[PDB]
Amino acid sequence: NTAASLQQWKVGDKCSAIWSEDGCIYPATIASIDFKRETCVVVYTGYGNREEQNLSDLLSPICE
Numbered sequence: 001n002t003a004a005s006l007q008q009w010k011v012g013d014k015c016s017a018i019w020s021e022d023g024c025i026y027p028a029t030i031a032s033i034d035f036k037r038e039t040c041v042v043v044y045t046g047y048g049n050r051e052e053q054n055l056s057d058l059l060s061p062i063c064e
């Protein structure tokens with residue numbers, strides 16, 4: 001699931017996310033989602049590093 005049925009984000013979606021150390025937003029792909037926790041792991045494009053994010057903190061994709 002019911003949590004997933006009411007969730008906008010899905011594995012593989014493009015989003016943007018805050019890279020907290022530099023205070024700036026960057027493109028990412030959602031690699032994993034825990035729908036109970038409402039957390040995910042994103043893969044930042046180009047760099048390829050992974051980070052946990054709250055689903056609540058994901059942003060609309062950067063225009064491309």
Ligand SMILES: N=c1c2c(n(Cc3ccc(F)cc3)c3c1CCC3)CCC2
Nearest residue numbers: 019022024025026027044045047048049
């Ligand atoms: N692995 C990253 C690294 C940086 N950043 C920040 C950064 C700063 C300037 C820029 F043009 C692109 C990324 C980011 C990631 C992933 C998401 C954003 C800065 C150094 C490594």
Ligand SMILES: [Mg+2]
Nearest residue numbers: 003035036037
């Ligand atoms: Mg719940």
Ligand SMILES: [Mg+2]
Nearest residue numbers: 034035036037
């Ligand atoms: Mg669980």
